[PDB]
Design an enzyme around this catalytic site. Structure first.
Site, PDB file in Angstrom:
ATOM      1  N   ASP A   1       0.667  -1.057  -0.191  1.00  0.00           N
ATOM      2  CA  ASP A   1      -0.565   0.017   0.066  1.00  0.00           C
ATOM      3  C   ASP A   1       0.685   1.453  -0.170  1.00  0.00           C
ATOM      4  O   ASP A   1       2.066   0.902   0.509  1.00  0.00           O
ATOM      5  CB  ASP A   1      -1.047   0.248   1.354  1.00  0.00           C
TER       6      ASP A   1
ATOM      7  N   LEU B   1      11.440 -19.674  -7.006  1.00  0.00           N
ATOM      8  CA  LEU B   1       9.976 -19.023  -6.228  1.00  0.00           C
ATOM      9  C   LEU B   1       8.788 -19.613  -6.700  1.00  0.00           C
ATOM     10  O   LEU B   1       8.352 -18.483  -8.031  1.00  0.00           O
ATOM     11  CB  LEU B   1      10.613 -17.630  -6.585  1.00  0.00           C
TER      12      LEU B   1
ATOM     13  N   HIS C   1       1.379   4.208  -9.497  1.00  0.00           N
ATOM     14  CA  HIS C   1       1.059   2.192  -9.896  1.00  0.00           C
ATOM     15  C   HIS C   1       2.557   2.341 -10.555  1.00  0.00           C
ATOM     16  O   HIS C   1       3.060   1.368 -10.459  1.00  0.00           O
ATOM     17  CB  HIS C   1       0.192   2.507 -11.568  1.00  0.00           C
TER      18      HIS C   1
END
Ligand SMILES: Cc1ccc(Oc2ccc(NC(=O)c3ccccc3C(=O)O)cc2)cc1C
Lengths: 225, 206
Positions: free
Chosen positions: B10, B104, B27
């Site tokens: 956030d 991963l 963004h």
């Protein structure tokens, strides 16, 4: 709504053992100081317009003697605190898996709830053999029984429906979770219920957590919300 | 050490606003910070990284070839059922491409909620009950666990939330029962390798 904005506070009470260890005392003295801190926090919540207070006595995240010690600590606490709670107009409820508690204790729990059930002041929920995952699973079992009866379609199950089957669904949503004792974890306390709650962690040990600390956590919620 | 880290990312909107720039710019800085966090987790042997954007197919598509080359398994978690079918198909194709990878595992939340995730597992069990393949008293924690997101991966060890809020905001609920929770005021676009190491320290200290 009070100025602090909190209707329902939940507290993971941790630090009783570390508190007694700091002073060169055995764990028992930490438990006694802990209980005094419970009475003080109950009385503070009731005086500060909180609707509901839910308390979790943290022991660990994991044996026979362990459960047994925790059971005895619950027995002692219930026996010792219920009359005082009733006299402070608190309505007591126990949440958690009490199914395998022996019938006599289950009776004592039930009488303590029935005694205080008409009280109009704070609602105090005490977690006993409680876990966030168990709470969800018991609500899932209630829905599954309804499906098996032919009363409920799997596709009608939504979040609101499961919400109505977890503990405390009838009380205000939990606004704030306080954990004392310095760990930054929920330790399988409320999970479903804390989706939108403010999480507030303090290093203060449970026996030392007093009205000024509780006031600080409410004010932090008021300011952050 | 820490096997599975989840991050609530956030602070993009607030970062843009501090920069005197439009939301879009934040963004784009947040996407650079994703790339950095993914590289860091993959270079440090973290098994799984799960990312939730708190405030898409194109971003995925343009990055999937590089993730695949880096032996990353890409999964999207959340309700993608109402995305247009073309995008659903592209999500499925990216997952299938990388599904065999053994490095991963990168889980990207899209339209995900922790309550939704539990409910989808409950609906599945409810189906089994109605078909007579399951007794309600047989439903236990391990069983429900097998029907929620990420049950094949290492348990979530650590949840990081950047941007200053101290809430889970209906990200993972079932899965964070025993996770370390690490909150930082650092805004997502500014969150770097040093910030990610400080979070892994908090885990190691405990
Ligand atoms: C008013 C009031 C205030 C505080 C209070 O603190 C508690 C609460 C719970 C436990 N024990 C269990 O929860 C327990 C019981 C059996 C088996 C396992 C467990 C387990 O801790 O896991 C002990 C003390 C009790 C009361 C009554």
């Amino acid at each position: 709504l009070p100025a602090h904005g909190c209707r329902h506070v939940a507290i993971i009470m941790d630090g009783n053992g570390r508190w007694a260890k700091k002073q060169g005392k055995i764990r028992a003295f930490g438990h006694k100081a802990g209980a005094k801190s419970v009475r003080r926090a109950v009385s503070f919540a009731a005086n500060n317009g909180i609707e509901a207070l839910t308390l979790y006595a943290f022991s660990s995240e994991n044996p026979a003697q362990e459960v047994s010690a925790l059971m005895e600590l619950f027995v002692w606490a219930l026996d010792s605190e219920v009359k005082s709670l009733h006299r402070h107009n608190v309505r007591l409820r126990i949440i958690g898996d009490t199914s395998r508690f022996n019938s006599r204790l289950q009776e004592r729990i039930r009488k303590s709830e029935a005694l205080t059930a008409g009280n109009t002041g704070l609602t105090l929920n005490i977690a006993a053999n409680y876990g966030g995952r168990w709470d969800i699973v018991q609500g899932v079992r209630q829905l599954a029984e309804k499906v098996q009866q032919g009363n409920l379609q799997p596709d009608q199950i939504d979040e609101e429906m499961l919400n109505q089957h977890v503990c405390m669904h009838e009380l205000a949503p939990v606004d704030l979770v306080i954990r004392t004792g310095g760990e930054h974890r929920i330790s399988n306390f409320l999970l479903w219920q804390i989706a939108y709650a403010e999480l507030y962690f303090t290093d203060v040990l449970w026996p030392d957590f007093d009205e000024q600390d509780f006031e600080g956590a409410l004010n932090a919620f008021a300011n952050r919300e």
